[PDB]
């Protein structure tokens, strides 16, 4: 696709305050709530908090580096819905689909012209 | 004074407008002295102001000017039909002034190209400041703020 | 420019000199200062001799030994002065006073190699003609430095052994300035001149 140049806005992960100091407090983002907190009051130098401005360009949203939207395919029927959107969606084979089944999803997607985001999954030579 | 600045439409800092000058307003400009830099425009500056920073109120919506028909439509009521017609109504304070002025959306002005001149912005111009009446000099300022 | 700019205090103003010597390391500039002792300053003598001792007293309480060490020897006097305008303490700093070097006298290998000065900082050229102005040498001494002489003496030597040098050179040139003179005025030359050279 002659896609627009995808602007990422904020590439760093939004970690949680103090998720580094304590092993109990986790990297999963949670707002700070104490009114004596500096993070909540966004003093200089302190960690960047997720606000709505970091929101991605609606034209480019969901678009992966390939410039395709990710899409999970379970079986060879589900794949063949994108028969029409090869230029736009990328057949992510789903993680639990076996070896014996995958090799079959790859047969079709190659034939149809669907770019599979995850080939070589379980599969060897 | 804060109330009064709002009544001139001088909301954000570096915003600029025109004012019809009588007894009434010449007492307002007294109140807002420390907050503004007011003076007498040329034909020229207006002309520079209006082609670059000139915008039109239409129901709400700050609309860009850039084609005469717009003013022809919204202000054709008052015998203004071009942009230069508009200018004519500003410079010579015309009979439809209140309308043509009000149709113009209060100018947005970038900080001066060359700086303010002074070190300290908040003294009366007369004693090496910026605020208040700077008469003709205003035209050197606005054109750096254009 | 030049990789090493051996300076030379001899009539500079501890300050100023410094500053610049400073900036220059910060901007990656291998310097080297010489004749520290012939560094100068501003003001009477019986001053710097204060604006110092005071400095001296300083020192630490409970443990005098651990504290503001009062160096005597010129060089250092002036060092300080400078390690005082260079965020010394931080890589980029250390990384400097790394680039520095301040000898009293003018020992090899520098004796043998051109030095220079730093306008923007000579007594002569900054001090309103005729005004009180101190001259390290004394000022060091007056407060510990035990050598003023060695330097001195083991100086005069240098100067000598040099000037001598000089000559030999002055003699040399002359010859050139003479050859060129004569074999000057023949075409070739001429031409040049036209262009300028």
């Amino acid at each position: 696709l002659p896609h627009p140049k995808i602007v990422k806005k904020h590439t760093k992960k939004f970690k949680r305050h103090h998720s580094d100091r304590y092993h109990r407090v986790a990297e999963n983002w949670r707002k700070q709530k104490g009114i004596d907190s500096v993070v909540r009051r966004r003093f200089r130098g302190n960690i960047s908090q997720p606000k709505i401005g970091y929101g991605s360009n609606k034209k480019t949203k969901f678009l992966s580096p390939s410039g395709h939207k990710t899409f999970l395919v379970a079986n060879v029927k589900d794949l063949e819905t994108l028969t029409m959107h090869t230029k736009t969606y990328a057949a992510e084979i789903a993680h639990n689909i076996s070896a014996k089944n995958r090799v079959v999803i790859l047969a079709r997607a190659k034939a149809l012209g669907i770019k599979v985001t995850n080939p070589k999954g379980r599969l060897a030579l | 004074p804060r109330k009064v600045l709002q009544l001139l439409r001088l909301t954000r800092i570096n915003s600029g407008t025109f004012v019809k000058v009588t007894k009434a307003t010449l007492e307002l400009l007294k109140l807002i002295e420390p907050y503004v830099a007011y003076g007498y425009p040329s034909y020229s500056t207006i002309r520079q102001l209006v082609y670059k920073r000139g915008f039109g109120k239409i129901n709400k919506q700050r609309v860009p000017l850039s084609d005469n028909a717009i003013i022809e439509a919204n202000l054709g009521k008052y015998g203004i039909l071009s942009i230069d017609d508009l200018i004519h109504e500003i410079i010579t304070v015309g009979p439809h002034f209140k309308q043509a002025n009000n149709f113009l959306w209060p100018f947005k002005l970038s900080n001066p190209s060359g700086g303010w001149g002074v070190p300290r912005k908040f003294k009366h111009f007369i004693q090496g400041g910026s605020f208040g009446n700077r008469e003709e000099f205003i035209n050197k300022l606005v054109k750096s703020m254009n | 420019v030049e990789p090493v700019v051996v300076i030379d205090g001899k009539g500079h103003l501890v300050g100023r000199l410094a500053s610049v010597v400073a900036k220059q390391l910060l901007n990656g500039q291998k310097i080297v200062v010489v004749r520290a002792e012939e560094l100068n300053i501003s003001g009477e003598f019986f001053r710097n001799k204060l604006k110092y001792h005071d400095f001296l007293r300083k020192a630490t309480a409970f443990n005098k030994t651990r504290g503001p060490f009062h160096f005597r020897a010129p060089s250092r006097i002036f060092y300080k002065a400078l390690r005082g305008m260079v965020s010394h303490k931080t890589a980029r700093g250390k990384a400097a006073l790394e680039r520095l070097k301040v000898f009293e006298g003018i020992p090899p290998p520098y004796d043998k190699k051109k030095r220079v000065v730093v306008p923007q900082a000579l007594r002569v050229l900054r001090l309103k003609p005729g005004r009180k102005y101190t001259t390290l040498g004394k000022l060091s001494t007056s407060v510990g430095w035990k050598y003023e002489d060695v330097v001195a003496k083991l100086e005069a030597k240098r100067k000598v052994s040099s000037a001598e040098y000089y000559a030999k050179k002055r003699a040399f040139t002359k010859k050139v300035a003479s050859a060129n003179a004569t074999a000057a005025e023949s075409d070739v030359a001429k031409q040049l001149a036209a262009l300028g050279y």
Binding site: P2, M84, H85, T86, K87, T88 | - | -
Partner: protein, 151 residues
């Protein structure tokens, strides 16, 4: 073109930029001596011959002088020196863009070299030291501040 679009791409708006021919900086008048700033032949003195259709310049050393073939080159990667030669004796109109396709050196290309070069050498031989000037390499020397420098 016969194959109907299997996918829905929207066609472009009708774009409004006509290509206009490139206006070269004043100093470049065919048969000028140049310095090349970048390339295999960076630092060489090189003669200007013809401005091209691809906004480039056709230039030769010439090859018999400094070892620069008939080459195209870009306008900005060159300093124009004031020294001009006679260029009007040269036939240049043979070479255009298409002269420079590739789909061990071609024996056709070397024949055009010597036609140009011998029709050029003559004019360089008139001026003193120019044959020598061209063979040398331009460089900057300590104290050449190139905002001061005249070319």
């Amino acid at each position: 073109p016969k194959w109907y679009p299997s996918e829905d791409v929207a066609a472009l708006k009708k774009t409004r930029k006509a290509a206009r021919p490139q206006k070269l900086r004043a100093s470049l008048v065919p048969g000028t001596v140049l310095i090349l700033l970048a390339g295999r032949f960076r630092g060489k003195r090189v003669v200007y011959l013809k401005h091209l259709e691809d906004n480039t310049l056709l230039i030769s050393g010439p090859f018999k002088v400094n070892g620069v073939p008939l080459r195209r080159v870009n306008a900005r990667y060159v300093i124009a020196t004031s020294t001009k030669v006679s260029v009007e004796g040269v036939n240049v109109e043979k070479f255009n863009v298409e002269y420079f396709a590739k789909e061990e050196i071609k024996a056709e290309r070397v024949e055009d070299q010597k036609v140009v070069d011998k029709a050029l050498i003559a004019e360089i031989k008139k001026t003193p030291l120019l044959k020598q000037y061209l063979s040398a390499s331009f460089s900057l020397k300590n104290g050449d501040k190139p905002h001061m420098l005249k070319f």
